[model samples]
Target: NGNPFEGVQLWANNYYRSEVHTLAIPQITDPALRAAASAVAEVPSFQWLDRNVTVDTLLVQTLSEIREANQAGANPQYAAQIVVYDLPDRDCAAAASNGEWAIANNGVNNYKAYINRIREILISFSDVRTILVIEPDSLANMVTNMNVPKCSGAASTYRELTIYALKQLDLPHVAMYMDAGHAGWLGWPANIQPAAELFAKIYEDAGKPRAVRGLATNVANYNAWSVSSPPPYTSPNPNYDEKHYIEAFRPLLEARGFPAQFIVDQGRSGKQPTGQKEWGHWCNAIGTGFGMRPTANTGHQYVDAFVWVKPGGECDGTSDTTAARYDYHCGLEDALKPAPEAGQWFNEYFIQLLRNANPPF
Candidate 1:
């Protein structure tokens, strides 16, 4: 009865399963080590909907997976993670995530068309629960780094489309959470208020206002609330965890008429923050591990659940210029270099995450 639908159902991605069942497991020589690594293999990774995926394709893939699961005698109650990426000019020139779609190139109507179709697809899944994390870095980047060259002149559009996305994706079967970034980005006193205020304004102005289920934190981050501390990065309480960050931000958002809930990503927080300024301390940091198991019983009513939104072992990006795509942050001398392109499987990295599992898996 440990079914995800009744509890925390993780949508294990096909590529991740293939990496484990076909490659990672077979490579392990030690039985004890193999058993532990095999457990990590079943952990789920959210399915990222980038610009390349069409609505028809998305529906087909999702329904097919569910159908297969059903045929296998799986429980009917299941939850799936669909990351709503592909906002025009996405990733704001962040190399690893930058895609061909852009407001300048496609215009707002096209963006709406893409989302409307997604709405249809989601609504078709009226039988199950769907949680969509809308645009991971859109608001966070717009708030923190809008002045950067790659991020200029698109804040208004990001705001408009995000509001639209919330309304369109708000079917009964789907729960939408706009990204609020991690504590490291908005945990500080100065940044958190403005960020929350921006969210409140956006929600208040959303044409279809009550569409959002909540705000999601640490969508694809490694910061673990369990080990978070006060002072420079967090509030002055030693126990200031992700739950604390959510509560601190809640009152501000609530005051502005947005009493939103929260979801967090603890997928790669088994290790402590690397404390490296150059890394922004997040991309594929070495020594990281699975932090918390996905759970609905977070001991806090406001928090929805802790999830593996970012699949561990997928290279955050590659440092190689010769690689298909490159992000400068990924290639730094301190980074886990010679990595694969962003979102692709990284064998040695996967092995490392398995070996580094906190509490030893």
Candidate 2:
């Protein structure tokens, strides 16, 4: 029997629905919140982007949905992709054999169990092309104390989670990208110095597993999804241009880091507002223009490519223009961007971010 609830209707009203031989619009969420957040919006883009989810349930539902959609021939050309991420929640903060498990494992034990279940699905399922952005803040975050008690003094638990995660996954199209907080989030833009990887494991040397492919930057939030352009000059903190966030990896590389290169998220960031504006309302976030562009030089070798990992238009912690997830009344929100999907301004800004030519940022 089907769930008799309205929210459950979200499952049936699938927009980008299909499993094989189709474009998969990925649905994502954090472990701790996945169990609770529901689809409240009616738009096609926002509907599937759930805030909370369960590894066990989502896996079942996905395969089932694929089968059903195929049987009905509803969306023969639509292959839906799901991005299972570990962030906001430090579920992977544990280990089973070593006492480090004390530090790696989050109290709930849900994350490890979640990934294990995910691994089982990958090993068992043949055509599951799931893109797993494993533990965004887990290894990258300098802050520890999730799985272990403060007394344990196990700070590098973040690294342990990555090793544990890699050991569990077993699939071909299962691309996993380690997280980089973003250009804005990192303390230093360039330098790739060990000190640079504030929330991440400085660099993921060993290059990359031919299977793993590459790593992803800017997952849960939109510090800047593939911000190629540099922000206009700001006072005090001068490295505001390309150094604002994810684009600052030049230093990470010059620092002779590990993870060879990274892919960016340009799903919806068209508004080209000057982020360095001294005023509020984003009048300062002006980029020459927006679309998906990255860095001062049109295309740099150190940087591989800019991919739209995070779909644009979705609310970033808020319905307003601000980063705060708080809901404000009668004001501009993230959803109401200058453009339709990623907002028109995003495109302009994207252009400026990459070229740094048009807008004298």
Candidate 3:
């Protein structure tokens, strides 16, 4: 009952026990693409509870369905993997994926209410196990992107509200994992210590809740789970892959008295050597594929699971250069074109992900 994955292998006996809940977005209408989307949907993936996308009635509805599915299953072990995004000044370093909340407009108070509502909904579904990856890119921005004025201004809110959310959602049926940016972001040696310090401080501030299990890495990004040899582009970062990043960062968290278990996102990471001039160029990356399936049988001691944190097919950001939320990264040559806004389904992209799947559909 503590850590749901404490001793048991989620994939023992060649079967995965913790099947994730897939969301109802990115609905495809095209015949061929719809076929591909159906196959992709067969695999368990995280449902992002970001504001404007999955909130309020949608949240309750999704949980109710997960609850019903679990009740109907022969083995009532289905898990709902959710991403609790929508922080104030969210994605401060980037326009794409920004949240509706603004720090200047009572965002902190509003966020508290939001978390409380989510807590209530989750509590109602106590029978369904829930795994939350808290606020992607929030804390990571504090570590390295402080030079950006938006990130700097929202720093305190990021810290305080993250602790607030963690404390509020510390339910027995919920296991929370704080987001740690992929190896490309915090894997640099200089950045590792500060990241660990910041995370440890926040954990302590939240009173070290037992439900706060560990860290989630590479959420909604394209970073390989593990690579035998570091790619040439990953130079200077010794922790070139998620596995090495977890191994390198775990000890520091332990040194700071924080649990260091990890769940790495392999969704959309199948095609590596990402063809980007810079490792930071994340958007609708071109030629990407669905990576490894989610499993608790991660071969590393510190890693708890390999998860599909980002649902494949949802646009990272719109490729439309004229759109208000458009980020230049989405328009780069390495990024897929004709993409829709973030969280919208991109038909062509979904097909490509299926066709190029590492383990082929």
lDDT of 3 at 62: 63
> How far out, in Å, is residue 192 in model 3?
0.7
- Model 1 has an lDDT value of 0.72
Which one is best on TM-score? 3
Judged by whole-model lDDT over C-alpha atoms, candidate 2 comes out at: 0.38
> Where does candidate 3 stray beyond 4 Å?
1-36
Residue-level lDDT of model 1, residues 53-120, one tens digit each, is 64577555775687567557675445677788878777774788776576778757778988988888
Error of 3 at 209 (Å): 0.5
Model 1 residue 228 lDDT score: 31
Model 1 alpha-carbon miss at residue 334, Å: 3.3
Q: Taking the tens digit of each residue's C-alpha lDDT, what string does model 3 give over 232-266? A: 77887898998888888989999999966888899
What lDDT does the true structure give each of the candidates?
0.72, 0.38, 0.79
Q: Specify the highest-lDDT model's number.
A: 3
Better by TM-score, candidate 3 or 2: 3
Looking at model 3, the pairs that clash are none
Give me the runs in candidate 1 sitting further than 4 Å from their true place: 1-8, 26-30, 67-76, 107-110, 208-211, 228-241, 273-279, 322-324
